[PDB]
């Protein structure tokens, strides 16, 4: 947290901005409150805070858990999409329904993405995620 960066608590220009900090929304405490919420980080001569990313508990949670949340949701959406696609093909109405979504079937697949990570891990160990270099017949060259 070095590099010549003053704490946002005691950076004079920080509170200087905080004084007439333009309260954005329809509540008078909007601006001031957020500046109060910006005492944990450490400002600089620009008067605005920089973010440190190291796992260092000074700013660890301020970047780690959002990353993990994104991984959660991206895994969910990718998993349910792939599962839906795999399911459609066992109907022999393939491209008919490619544009007409079968809602009574599209729902439970979406609702059943609860345990995507570890299940995916299983498909990794079972090897249920990849087809074989030559079995996949998509010809290169």
């Amino acid at each position: 947290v070095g590099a010549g960066l003053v704490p946002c608590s005691e950076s004079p220009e920080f509170i200087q901005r905080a004084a007439s900090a333009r309260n954005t929304t329809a509540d008078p405490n909007s601006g001031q409150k957020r500046f109060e919420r910006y005492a944990q980080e450490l400002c600089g001569p620009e008067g605005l805070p920089h973010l440190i990313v190291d796992g260092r508990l000074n700013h660890a949670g301020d970047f780690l858990i959002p990353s993990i949340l994104f991984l959660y949701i991206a895994g969910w959406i990718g998993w349910v999409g792939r599962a839906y696609l795999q399911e459609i093909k066992k109907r022999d109405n393939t491209e008919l329904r490619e544009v007409i979504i079968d809602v009574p079937t599209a729902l439970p697949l979406m609702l059943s993405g609860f345990t995507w990570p570890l299940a995916a891990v299983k498909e990794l160990l079972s090897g249920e995620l990849v087809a074989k270099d030559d079995e996949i017949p998509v010809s290169p060259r």
Binding site: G2, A3, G4, L5, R17, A21, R22, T24, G31, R34, F35, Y38, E46, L48, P49, H50, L51, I52, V53, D54, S139, P140, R141
Partner: protein
């Protein structure tokens, strides 16, 4: 059959395109009709000779001209202020204030300012008077002429080298890497200690007095006794002035390191010791291979080693290498590509080791010169590499045999090219998406009046490497910031002066950084990533595609393959080259403007604007785009003129050719022929002018030629304006 003779075919067509195609093949030799290898080899020998000859002529040109009508000595007297001279000016069409805004440095004729900067380098080499470079021109001229004649001689029958004489490599290897520059840097070192250092210390040593006077009073003592510290005698003092003796020195080979407190440049004795080091190092590197004599390393069979210590190998590092070492001796495009890539890389490195390590005196203070040189060299560098990639691509079609390389490392690369290009596309998409998202983040958040709701990153890896090299600014006490670690008693044996220098980060020596640098550096990453992407795509399609595999036989040529599926235009193996050229131009523009803004803020120390408006792009186009142009835009106007009118003309000329490029690029050859018909219809039927007729029946342009001319117009338009802008700004703001 006269023109063009080198192709009996092309002289059988009554369309003006003949001429157009007549002058786009005269330098593609192996495509001419009827010339086997040794013909090509020998005439390439001669033509390369001619190339270096005209290089010598160019050098003589510039040097004699500055010897004629310059102020080199008037630049000796008052160096840091007097401006150099390019040459005379002579044009009847000229303006009025031109003569009125040109004659300076005591001159009465229309002098032309100089910017390349040969004065500093030359005086650094130790020149004093006009006659010096007068004679210099006079003799390298005869050198050029003799070299030309040498080129002529080997054309005679009894002086025709052998193809085997060309294939044998190791002699050329040793002779070059030892006897081309090793001995040559030795000779330069001799010129340094005999002439350069004396002239630096104020003593004049001509072409006659050098025979009797010494480099060092202790000279020849450590010659053959081995106390080389004696030549490392009293170094130059802390007040010495070049060309003078105020606090002089009597040391020949020093290792002071850092800078000289007056010229803020590299020390000359460090230079001499450096050159000596690399000279002897290349000489010991000289005898490294095997010659015709019977010892050493047989290159074409060293890597023909598939056994050692029982466990045989697959090759060195345990990978196949058998059968390709003839190719580097078979093909020429291969060696050409390697050389081009190498050259471009080291040129970029050169362009990087200039603005921090001033090699010559007065380099740092004179901004315009070094700035122009930096962007000049980097621009030279960029598409120099594109040449390497293009010749790699053309090698892939012409010079390649299949069975000779069955199963070696090359084929194992081709077998998995797919994952390569896929992951490359992946990283490009990722970096682009996220950098643009963060940018637009900043834009909208600041577009609401609250900047605190906006993200600021902070790079620390470069901070760590900065302190770890020995920077103390950040106070981490690691690796020469820790003056007590294990390596804290090492480095240079004269690291105190280096430490005084680097601690004094007041000059251009590893300046601090912030979030913006994080941003733009990721932008560079993206740029080169997509550039190499398109280039390698074209390269690895030089043979054929999934939906067009035949093209290997169609050639590095036009093929269009008319509208089979929606069309197949731009599939011709250097369609990729155009795209790559665009993707390189914008990249180099990004980087050079980054450098420009950085150093501009460093000039007057006001770094606030950069760090303050680097986040959102409004700041980018508002703080530096038009906030420096009124200093240039009014070079001429309805009220007066300046010494910049020519530069505004530069601007506008460039813009014009730029848009002309668009004209050539968009419209295509299915419309520019219908009206040529009716326009031929005219001459046939008007009277008093139907007398004359056609040298040759005119038709519309060609497709590939249209693409080429459009690209040329675009690139020339891009080049000019930016140069004018940069030099005008630097010389107008300081």
């Amino acid at each position: 059959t006269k023109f063009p003779k080198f192709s009996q075919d092309l002289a059988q067509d009554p369309t003006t395109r003949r001429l157009w195609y007549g002058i786009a093949t005269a330098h593609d030799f192996e495509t001419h009709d009827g010339m086997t290898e040794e013909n090509l080899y020998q005439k390439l020998f001669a033509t390369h000779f001619g190339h270096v000859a005209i290089i010598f002529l160019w050098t003589s040109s510039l040097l004699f001209h500055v010897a004629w009508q310059g102020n080199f000595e008037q630049w000796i007297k008052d160096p840091l202020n007097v401006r150099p001279i390019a040459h005379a000016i002579w044009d009847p069409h000229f303006g009025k204030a031109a003569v009125d805004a040109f004659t300076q440095a005591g001159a009465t004729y229309p002098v032309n300012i100089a910017y390349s900067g040969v004065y500093h380098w030359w005086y650094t080499i130790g020149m004093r008077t006009n006659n010096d470079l007068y004679s210099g021109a006079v003799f390298l001229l005869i050198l050029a002429g003799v070299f030309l004649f040498a080129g002529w001689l080997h054309l005679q029958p009894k002086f025709r080298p052998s193809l085997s004489w060309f294939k044998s490599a190791e002699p050329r290897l040793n002779h070059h890497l030892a006897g081309l520059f090793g001995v040559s840097s030795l000779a330069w070192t001799g010129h340094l200690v005999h002439v350069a250092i004396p002239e630096s210390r104020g003593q004049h040593v001509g072409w006659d007095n050098f025979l009797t006077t010494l480099p060092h009073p202790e000279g020849l003592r450590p010659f053959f006794t081995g106390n080389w510290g004696v030549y490392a005698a009293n170094p130059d003092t802390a007040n010495h002035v070049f060309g003078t003796s105020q606090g002089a020195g009597t040391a020949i080979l020093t290792f002071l390191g850092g800078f000289h407190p007056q010229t803020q440049s590299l020390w000359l004795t460090d230079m001499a010791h450096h050159h000596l080091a690399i000279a002897v190092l290349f000489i010991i590197a000289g005898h490294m291979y095997r010659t015709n004599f019977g010892i050493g390393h047989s290159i074409k069979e060293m890597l023909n080693a598939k056994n050692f210590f029982g466990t045989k190998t697959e090759g060195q590092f345990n990978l196949p290498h058998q059968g390709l070492y003839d190719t580097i001796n078979n093909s020429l495009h291969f060696q050409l590509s390697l050389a081009l890539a190498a050259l471009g890389t080291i040129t970029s490195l050169v362009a990087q080791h200039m603005y921090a390590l001033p090699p010559y005196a007065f380099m740092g203070q004179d901004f315009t010169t070094q700035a122009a040189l930096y962007t000049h060299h980097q621009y030279i560098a960029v598409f120099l590499m594109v040449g390497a990639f293009a010749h790699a691509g053309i090698f892939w079609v012409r010079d390649y045999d299949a069975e000779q390389n069955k199963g070696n490392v090359l084929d194992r690369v081709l077998q998995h090219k797919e994952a390569i290009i896929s992951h490359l596309s992946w990283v490009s998409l990722f970096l682009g998406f996220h950098t643009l998202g963060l940018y637009v983040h900043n834009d909208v958040v600041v577009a609401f009046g609250t900047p605190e709701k906006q993200i600021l990153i902070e790079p620390v890896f470069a901070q760590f490497i900065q302190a770890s090299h020995g920077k103390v600014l950040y106070g981490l006490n690691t690796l020469l910031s820790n003056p007590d670690s294990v390596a804290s008693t090492a480095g240079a044996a004269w690291l105190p002066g280096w430490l005084d220098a680097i601690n004094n980060g007041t000059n251009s020596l590893f300046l601090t950084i912030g979030p913006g640098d994080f941003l733009v550096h990721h932008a560079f990453a993206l740029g080169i990533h997509t550039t190499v992407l398109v280039l390698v795509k074209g390269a690895l399609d030089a043979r054929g595609s999934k939906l067009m595999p035949d093209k290997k036989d169609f050639g590095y040529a036009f093929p269009c393959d008319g509208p089979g599926r929606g069309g197949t235009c731009d599939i011709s193996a250097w369609d990729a080259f155009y795209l790559a050229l665009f993707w390189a131009l914008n990249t180099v523009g990004w980087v050079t403007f980054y450098w420009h803004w950085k150093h501009l803020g460093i000039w007057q120390g006001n770094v606030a604007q950069f760090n303050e408006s680097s986040t959102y792009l409004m700041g980018w186009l508002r703080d530096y785009l038009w906030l420096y142009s009124a200093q240039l835009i009014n070079g001429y106007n309805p009220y007066g003129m300046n010494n910049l009118s020519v530069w505004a003309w530069m601007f506008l000329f460039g813009h014009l050719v730029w848009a002309t490029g668009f004209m050539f690029l968009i419209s295509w050859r299915g419309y520019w022929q219908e009206l040529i018909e009716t326009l031929v219809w005219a001459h046939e039927r008007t009277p008093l002018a139907s007398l004359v007729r056609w040298k040759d029946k005119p038709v519309a342009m060609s497709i590939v030629q249209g693409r080429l001319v459009g690209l040329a117009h675009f690139t020339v338009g891009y080049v000019l304006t930016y140069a004018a802008f940069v030099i005008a700004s630097t010389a107008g703001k300081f």
